[PDB]
Amino acid sequence: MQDAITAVINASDVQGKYLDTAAMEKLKAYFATGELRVRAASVISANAANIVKEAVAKSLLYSDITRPGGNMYTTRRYAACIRDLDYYLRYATYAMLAGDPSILDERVLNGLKETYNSLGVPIAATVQAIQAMKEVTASLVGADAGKEMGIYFDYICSGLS
Amino acid sequence: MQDAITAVINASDVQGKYLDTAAMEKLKAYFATGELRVRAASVISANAANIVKEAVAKSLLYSDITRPGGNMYTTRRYAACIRDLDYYLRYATYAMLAGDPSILDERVLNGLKETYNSLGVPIAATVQAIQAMKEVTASLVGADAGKEMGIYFDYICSGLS
Amino acid sequence: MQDAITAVINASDVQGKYLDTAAMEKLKAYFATGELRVRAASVISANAANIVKEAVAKSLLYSDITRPGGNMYTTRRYAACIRDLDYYLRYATYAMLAGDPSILDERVLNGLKETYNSLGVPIAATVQAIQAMKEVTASLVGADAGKEMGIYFDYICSGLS
Amino acid sequence: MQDAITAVINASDVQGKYLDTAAMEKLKAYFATGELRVRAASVISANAANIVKEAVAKSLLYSDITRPGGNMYTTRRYAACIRDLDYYLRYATYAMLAGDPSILDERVLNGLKETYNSLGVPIAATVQAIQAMKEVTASLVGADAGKEMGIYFDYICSGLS
Amino acid sequence: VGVGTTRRRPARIFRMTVGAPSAEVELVINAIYCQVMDVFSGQVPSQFRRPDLESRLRNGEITVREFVRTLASSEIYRNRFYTPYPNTKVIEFLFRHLLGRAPATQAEIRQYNKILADQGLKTAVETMVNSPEYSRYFGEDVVPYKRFPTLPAGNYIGSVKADADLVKQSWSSLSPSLVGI
Amino acid sequence: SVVTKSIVNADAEARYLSPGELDRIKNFVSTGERRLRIAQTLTENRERIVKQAGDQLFQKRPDVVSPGGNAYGEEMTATCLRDLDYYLRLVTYGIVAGDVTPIEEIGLVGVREMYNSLGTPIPAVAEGIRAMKNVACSLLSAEDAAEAGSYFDFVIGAMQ
Amino acid sequence: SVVTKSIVNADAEARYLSPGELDRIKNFVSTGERRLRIAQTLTENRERIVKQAGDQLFQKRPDVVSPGGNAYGEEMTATCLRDLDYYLRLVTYGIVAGDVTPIEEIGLVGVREMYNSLGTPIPAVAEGIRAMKNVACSLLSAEDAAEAGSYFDFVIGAMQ
Amino acid sequence: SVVTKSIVNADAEARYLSPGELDRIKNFVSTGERRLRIAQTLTENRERIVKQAGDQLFQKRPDVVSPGGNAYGEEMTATCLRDLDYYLRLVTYGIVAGDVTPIEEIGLVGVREMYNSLGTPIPAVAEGIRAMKNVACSLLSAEDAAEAGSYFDFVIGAMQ
Amino acid sequence: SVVTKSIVNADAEARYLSPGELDRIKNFVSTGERRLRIAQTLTENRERIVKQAGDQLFQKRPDVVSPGGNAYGEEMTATCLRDLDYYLRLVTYGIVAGDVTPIEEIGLVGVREMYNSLGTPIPAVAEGIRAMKNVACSLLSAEDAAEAGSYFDFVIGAMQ
Amino acid sequence: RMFKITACVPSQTRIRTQRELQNTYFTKLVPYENWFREQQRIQKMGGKIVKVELFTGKP
């Protein structure tokens, strides 16, 4: 398992060395910014439904995707699409709290591109929907917290593409 | 799975337009064929076991495959060969009634070639047996029914090889 | 799995003919070797833990692998190394007592190299440990038993190579 | 399960009334004793194995139950006797820290009497062992901690009844 | 180019659950054999089937969960899956046959691997039968069915690939020659 | 199709199609012409049918189309009419199919989740389908209304 | 409660709580007085908060109080106030507990099923919860409002 | 081999082969010499015993030999005799092995399904195997024959 | 290699390496890590690629292993798998080199002459290497498989 | 040796649409070793153990 503090600990364990000053400083930075990250994460969870609604409205709705034959034409596909965005956001916020991009790669980005390719989901459309979520999440979270959230959101998009 | 009517409905849904005249006559072709289909299906079920016996007798019985070391030269191996042939026949009869090859693709022909290869069972031997079963089935079902049963069984044989 | 007597039977079955007198003489040789193999196998089971400890001391003890970051330097990793060596010893004892190496190939070998490659465990280090285990096992079992058990262990090492 | 606060909340929910000052006083008592209870529970965790050993000796040291035909006169029987007491001690420690015994009754006491009756194991002998465990735990943890441990052990004795 | 509704729509399957005694109880019995053991056709429960387990289930004394545990523990399951296939693949076979899904992670493999190495196959099948996932996903008194798990990481593609992997190799005596007429 | 549903049941049963199942397939073959005629009538009167249904639904629940409502405004009202039209086309497909199989895969699986996400009122959508059923009964023959009403009724129940 | 969740994890582990888990218990013990004080304020001003939040909810979603809405008429509106009061008291119980688990056990499990069956709009109920949170923010100190807002927000998410 | 079956049980137990199981293997090593002499006698009477038993079986089931039976005609009768000969060879191999599992894998596993496809009568085949056992009792020494009769009986029971 | 081919062309036209050619040389050297990783995977799985793909070849072309064929007998089939082993080795060399000139230099100049002298079917060798490519697709990730696939493509294309 | 145990577990977490009365109240037989894990699992679910009985003759 990987977290920001845990990854510093894991690197130190591989060395076998006692805690270095550089390791202490990096861990201190994680301790320092945890407050802003925590408050924003709570806000994200509270307004999670509104965020995915805003994202599909801004990117994935009123287009050919939701018009016939667009991989969202049916209610089953639409429900799976909003569910997929919801999972993307949930594991992304998990990782944003953790501070480490490794967690999302472990769960969200493990075979995700292959699965989407097999099912015929548009990779680009998913990426643009993720970016639209990034804008909405930045608006709700605020600039300081949203910038941190944006980095891990963008890591998810990079894994997809 | 799919049907003739269901597949036309799927195509119309993809297009996003209510039933056209072309849709009407494609569906009407299935409606007309229904009588032939159901009569043939009853005959196929009645003579299903005899069909398998006739096919293997015509193709693989009294041959080196039946003789020791031929992949059918055991009681268990022989039973398995008859079983797989019955599996193909039953799904093919389903598919003939359905009018579409989606059932055969989804269930009958999924990974079958790779599994057969790794086992070492001869794909060519199976294909010859399937053609023999097609001949026996066409004789039993009738000329018009044999033509349709030929198409479905051809999908199974071609997918296997 | 397969046994020595079963292998002679399998050859006779592939030929189709009844077992020859010379083939029966080969089976009798297997029967004669079985008595010494059985007594040695009982000895091997009794000192199996000591043999594993001796081989681990020969290679793993005071090694960079045990040192931090050496891929054997974890509590889970050390436990897994011990368990893997024990499993190899158990399969090897079964193969030597049976007198046929087919069981070892059937269970231990299939994708063992692939699994080790995926895990990142050092195949060469495991092979050296296997040779050390073979030496200790030969010493405990005896010279005549060491030839058979050593041959089976060499076969496993050859597959790894 | 339940806690001290949760039990007060359950009573208030049945009443339907807003938070009461008397309920606040009870919750305040739980909060005030919680710090001491937490420190004591940590001590109990640290010396849990030693406490189990001492109690097991006190109730069963060269015991007739250990002697053949005494229902604890097997390696499996002795191990099972140790295991049940250890599980009871752990659950009791959690209940004592929580301040509510309902969870202990539901998880442990429910069905335990029926199982013990079917096995034929002596509930009174187990109760004597539980009393010995209570005495040893009170000695190690302290008098104030022993009072809470005594309440949990009394619930265990009632479950034996 | 518009994708029709058949774009991974039909992977699901009919669910078999126990009920009041009727001839349909043997259909449920057939399903238990058909899934816990890999009888490919689904119309041929071969000789090896356990009729005493069927009798207990018909009476109601044995729940479907217990039926699955006995069937998995029996030498029938061992001979068809445990002894021929390597233990590494046996873990995946247990996950596919019992829970209905491919092994989600190497960590799941790790837990079951030490169980197999030391405790034994019967212990491993018992642990999976008693596992919390079986209680809800597969259900209690419900015949386990193939399930494609979306939430676990890469489990849809892994489950699809593993389910696509039909059983290869066999319990082998008098192994076949390469060429036949 | 009805044949598709029977095939699914047969595949689960691991048995050839039952004689009674084949008999229902034969009935579907016989009723193909009548079902196609009913579907043609619905498609022919499509615009007027859903227009009247939209007026009836907005009359029954004026808050769907009022300020603060989900479909407040001309564009969103047109989108609401499109959703109703999607349902109408699905009902025509289902009437041709002779089974609920066509509709269930499109608009009856997860539809509650989708509508909850967008914000549209599920009960009001169900009432709109009911208004369509009344209009269709008016525009179809008596027994044609019975069959079409049955397929419509399954759609309405799914919305619930 | 925090202790209750720790007990659940410990029950599965059959092992004593780790130092971090004990630290969580100690933190709850340390802030028990703070939780009781916040509950004192909320309970004392509970009725006033309920009436103010009702006014806010009716302004934001007048359809609920409009003709044809669920809370049309004095009796229905009083039932709406009672339901909001039940939610607010549940929030107070959860705040005292320190975890959303007590509130979740009391309600919000199957709340969608129950309220939708009753015929009141789930979004409007959620809006009322939001109004209650805003009133609590006005009537409470910021530090206490942070915790109270968190538990309120959990209720809002469950309502969603 | 019996050792192979014991090894399979040990592998399921995840334990090294039991001392009692090893002793059983040693006991069969002792039994193998006498079994080999018996097997040599079986190979010596490979054809003569088959002919005598086949005459007895044909007397038992005249209908099969009669036209319209399974073994109708010289070619079909020869095929029936060849199947009996293959069973006899399998019996000899299984007797030498000591484990009926080798015989079961080679044949009698799914043999009923094969017979259903081929049209062969299981009762007549079973009677022929029993007649072979009686002929073998005359052919071989009683001490060796008692074990051989049990192997033949295992095949007969699988047929029945 | 890319470096040697660039040098050869520059040598022919009597020019020092162009700036773009220097960039390509630099890029190939830097991505050599990925190149070595792909080759390491292939050499790690030399056994199954050859074995599985060769079995697929025999099944696809039964005539090669039939009596009176080039591969009849285990000795000849062993040599056939040896040839497939040689070509996989050349492919790994080519991946490491970054160019197909090592593959061509070793084993595609005159394959028709050699194989026709042996009697081996050249199209059958091509189909066996196609089988190796298909096996390679599973072993290598999609991005990696495209890189190795091109070398396999050159081998089969020259073979035909 | 096995035990006949009947227990009822309320499905509070999942309000299952599919018929769950059989799961809610059930009577089953578990092996003696299996009974330890099964009793702990039923306790973890929170279901009440209505009865514990021993099918085997000897305790």
Ligand SMILES: CCC1=C(C)/C(=C/C2=NC(=C\c3[nH]c(/C=C4\NC(=O)[C@H](C)[C@H]4CC)c(C)c3CCC(=O)O)/C(CCC(=O)O)=C2C)NC1=O
């Ligand atoms: C095949 C199944 C299927 C259906 C039916 C479907 C419909 C559908 N309806 C939508 C919107 C909508 N649907 C409604 C619905 C209503 N408002 C009301 O007042 C009424 C009570 C009600 C209908 C009678 C509204 C208002 C919108 C627009 C939402 C907005 O933009 O504010 C949208 C999102 C916008 C878009 O089209 O991109 C879709 C996809 N999609 C599907 O895949």
Ligand SMILES: CCC1=C(C)/C(=C/C2=NC(=C\c3[nH]c(/C=C4\NC(=O)[C@H](C)[C@H]4CC)c(C)c3CCC(=O)O)/C(CCC(=O)O)=C2C)NC1=O
């Ligand atoms: C928690 C990490 C995680 C993720 C992200 C994940 C993704 C994921 N998305 C899936 C499907 C899907 N994904 C989509 C996605 C989309 N379709 C569109 O038109 C949009 C552009 C887009 C999202 C807005 C759809 C429509 C399906 C279902 C396809 C179908 O069955 O028809 C599936 C297949 C199983 C299923 O249908 O649920 C997985 C496993 N799985 C995971 O464990």
Ligand SMILES: CCC1=C(C)/C(=C/C2=NC(=C\c3[nH]c(/C=C4\NC(=O)[C@H](C)[C@H]4CC)c(C)c3CCC(=O)O)/C(CCC(=O)O)=C2C)NC1=O
């Ligand atoms: C290694 C295990 C094994 C066995 C035993 C085996 C038997 C076997 N018996 C066969 C035929 C047959 N078997 C019988 C058997 C009988 N008819 C009678 O009246 C008697 C009661 C009885 C024997 C005593 C007959 C009549 C046929 C020919 C069927 C036909 O074509 O009409 C055939 C089909 C023809 C062929 O060989 O191609 C096989 C494969 N195959 C195997 O792989």
Ligand SMILES: CCC1=C(C)/C(=C/C2=NC(=C\c3[nH]c(/C=C4\NC(=O)[C@H](C)[C@H]4CC)c(C)c3CCC(=O)O)/C(CCC(=O)O)=C2C)NC1=O
């Ligand atoms: C997707 C549907 C589906 C297919 C296609 C399928 C095939 C399939 N065939 C198999 C084996 C087999 N299949 C055959 C069949 C044959 N023997 C012959 O002589 C013929 C050439 C041929 C067909 C007439 C044989 C002999 C085996 C191996 C049996 C054994 O030795 O254990 C196996 C391995 C397990 C087993 O032994 O049964 C599978 C999974 N399973 C499936 O679920």
Ligand SMILES: CCC1=C(C)/C(=C/C2=NC(=C\c3[nH]c(/C=C4\NC(=O)[C@H](C)[C@H]4CC)c(C)c3CCC(=O)O)/C(CCC(=O)O)=C2C)NC1=O
């Ligand atoms: C990161 C976690 C981790 C640990 C802890 C670990 C321990 C560890 N302890 C070892 C040996 C040892 N451990 C002890 C331990 C003790 N002897 C005593 O009398 C004391 C009671 C006690 C220590 C306080 C001894 C004596 C050896 C040497 C044994 C020998 O080689 O003969 C070895 C084998 C030699 C080697 O290092 O190669 C390992 C791997 N390995 C790990 O990866």
Ligand SMILES: CCC1=C(C)/C(=C/C2=NC(=C\c3[nH]c(/C=C4\NC(=O)[C@H](C)[C@H]4CC)c(C)c3CCC(=O)O)/C(CCC(=O)O)=C2C)NC1=O
């Ligand atoms: C059929 C019998 C059988 C075998 C052989 C087997 C092998 C096997 N070895 C494993 C792991 C492992 N094996 C090792 C072994 C070693 N590390 C070293 O430094 C040494 C060179 C070496 C021992 C000689 C390690 C470290 C792991 C764990 C990998 C990890 O998570 O880091 C795993 C992964 C799951 C686990 O953690 O157990 C398997 C499946 N599994 C089996 O069921």
Ligand SMILES: CCC1=C(C)/C(=C/C2=NC(=C\c3[nH]c(/C=C4\NC(=O)[C@H](C)[C@H]4CC)c(C)c3CCC(=O)O)/C(CCC(=O)O)=C2C)NC1=O
């Ligand atoms: C029938 C199967 C069976 C066995 C074997 C068994 C063993 C057993 N050994 C015990 C103690 C003991 N066992 C030992 C053993 C040893 N100390 C040493 O230095 C030696 C290396 C070694 C013996 C060779 C000792 C010293 C005690 C006493 C410890 C104590 O209680 O203070 C006790 C606890 C005291 C008692 O009897 O109540 C039991 C029950 N119980 C059983 O039901």
Ligand SMILES: CCC1=C(C)/C(=C/C2=NC(=C\c3[nH]c(/C=C4\NC(=O)[C@H](C)[C@H]4CC)c(C)c3CCC(=O)O)/C(CCC(=O)O)=C2C)NC1=O
């Ligand atoms: C929630 C915690 C929990 C409890 C309490 C529990 C009770 C419990 N105690 C058992 C056995 C047992 N318990 C004992 C206990 C004793 N024998 C004695 O002489 C002493 C007086 C006494 C200990 C103080 C014995 C001997 C058995 C095994 C019965 C046998 O086979 O003989 C068993 C049978 C299964 C097993 O072997 O574990 C259960 C289920 N199970 C649980 O999960």
Ligand SMILES: CCC1=C(C)/C(=C/C2=NC(=C\c3[nH]c(/C=C4\NC(=O)[C@H](C)[C@H]4CC)c(C)c3CCC(=O)O)/C(CCC(=O)O)=C2C)NC1=O
């Ligand atoms: C451990 C070995 C074992 C035994 C002994 C056993 C008994 C047993 N016999 C049963 C059924 C039955 N037993 C009979 C027996 C008879 N009917 C008559 O007229 C005769 C007098 C008599 C036979 C001599 C019948 C008819 C049933 C079926 C009842 C039904 O479900 O309809 C059932 C009900 C479940 C079922 O099998 O359908 C059990 C449990 N089960 C076992 O696992």
Ligand SMILES: CCC1=C(C)/C(=C/C2=NC(=C\c3[nH]c(/C=C4\NC(=O)[C@H](C)[C@H]4CC)c(C)c3CCC(=O)O)/C(CCC(=O)O)=C2C)NC1=O
């Ligand atoms: C075959 C069809 C079928 C029935 C009938 C059935 C009954 C049934 N009702 C249950 C629960 C329940 N049923 C009620 C019912 C009521 N409370 C009241 O005040 C009313 C008077 C009454 C409804 C009219 C309640 C409150 C529970 C939950 C009890 C709990 O776990 O706390 C449960 C517990 C499991 C669950 O949560 O579903 C079952 C099994 N189960 C079934 O599968």
